[PDB]
């Protein structure tokens, strides 16, 4: 039986707050539905023995959508009752599409067959979260059945530090492909997971992983104080730039608002947020409580006003509203008691919407795990 079974109740950080209109029970069975709901929709066959997630309609995969099926499995045990069969699935689809770069990470992409599509190389997030959702499933599970987990967890993590870390440099790279001079100092701040780094450091003994968190609290304060000072807001992607990180400019690798809050840094204030609730670490506090701040009065505390796009100084470049968006505000707003309100309105929000898509719908899930106080570590 599962060690760490759903819900478990974390105890976040003193001064944390959770949505306090609502009962517990409430939320956890929230939860509850939006994982089925989830796993209807998304969680699909790969043959025998094997699982995957399907982002888009048309059954593609990428492996940050390989991650957060990980991840959620493992959360959700206690549950779900076939949680470790399909992280064990899950598990045998990622052995089975190693990256051409080092044969621990995930190539990034497949079609609806299976096959690796543009570049077999890997992605740094989905990487990260396969690690950590394999630590997970040691607490969960042990390590002691058909697959060793801490074992396949550290086995990924050194290939993570060793391919998809800039050692000079102490940054997380885009993937392990990103090694030239264009992008092998650029780094994406949704892969700030700053707590799954802990998790790494605690697993191997490798205090590289110290040296990247250091560096990356020093990253997220020195962008926030020069490029967004008056939002809190990360930049989809960060450069090098002589002696400073500076946000990408259009176009750099995705597009227009490369260096604006986008689609990927919309998960910052969920993955950031994360290490201050679990372990007190406050050195971004300020740039979290200043996006709490800036967001909530931007909206007038509606959260059906967030739109899926800012510049850095707080101008909307998004056209409509995106759970994908909304929901990470709601876990950052869990820093003060001052944002009580706020979150009760996200919550409400996240928890009533619909099924927007394969990544609004996973952003959600996890922002609600997260709120409702079910998250953890290792």
Request: aromatic share 12%.
């Amino acid at each position: 039986a599962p060690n760490k079974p759903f819900p478990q109740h974390t105890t976040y950080t003193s001064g944390s707050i959770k949505p306090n209109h609502v009962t517990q029970s409430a939320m956890d069975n929230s939860v509850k539905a939006k994982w089925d709901s989830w796993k209807s929709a998304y969680l699909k066959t790969a043959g025998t023995g094997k699982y995957y997630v399907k982002y888009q309609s048309n059954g593609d995969t990428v492996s940050e959508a390989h991650g957060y099926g990980m991840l959620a499995t493992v959360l959700m045990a206690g549950y779900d009752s076939n949680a470790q069969t399909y992280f064990d699935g899950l598990y045998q689809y990622y052995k089975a599409h190693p990256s051409s770069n080092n044969s621990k990470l995930m190539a990034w992409k497949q079609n609806s067959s299976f096959q690796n599509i543009e570049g077999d190389d890997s992605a740094t997030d989905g990487d990260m979260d396969i690690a950590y959702s394999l630590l997970l499933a040691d607490k969960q599970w042990g390590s002691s059945g058909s697959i060793n987990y801490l074992q396949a967890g550290k086995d990924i993590i050194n290939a993570i530090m060793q391919s998809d870390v800039n050692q000079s440099q102490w940054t997380l790279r885009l993937g392990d492909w990103a090694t030239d001079n264009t992008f092998k100092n650029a780094t994406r701040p949704s892969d700030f997971m700053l707590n799954h780094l802990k998790a790494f450091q605690a697993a191997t003994g490798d205090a590289r992983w110290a040296n990247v968190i250091d560096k990356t609290y020093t990253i997220i304060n020195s962008l926030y104080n020069g490029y967004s000072s008056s939002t809190g807001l990360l930049p989809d992607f960060v450069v090098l730039s002589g002696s400073t990180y500076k946000p990408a400019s259009a176009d750099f690798l995705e597009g227009a608002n490369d260096g604006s809050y986008d689609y990927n840094s919309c998960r910052t204030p969920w993955r950031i947020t994360t290490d201050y609730l679990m372990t007190g670490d406050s050195r971004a506090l300020n740039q979290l409580n200043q996006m709490n701040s800036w967001i909530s009065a931007k909206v007038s505390g509606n959260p059906s006003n967030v739109k899926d796009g800012y510049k850095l100084n707080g101008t909307v470049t998004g056209s409509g509203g995106s759970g994908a968006f909304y929901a990470p505000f709601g876990v950052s707003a869990m820093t003060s008691s001052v944002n009580q309100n706020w979150l009760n309105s996200v919550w409400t929000k996240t928890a009533g919407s619909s099924n927007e898509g394969y990544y609004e719908d996973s952003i959600k899930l996890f922002s609600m795990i997260v709120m409702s106080g079910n998250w953890w570590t290792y």
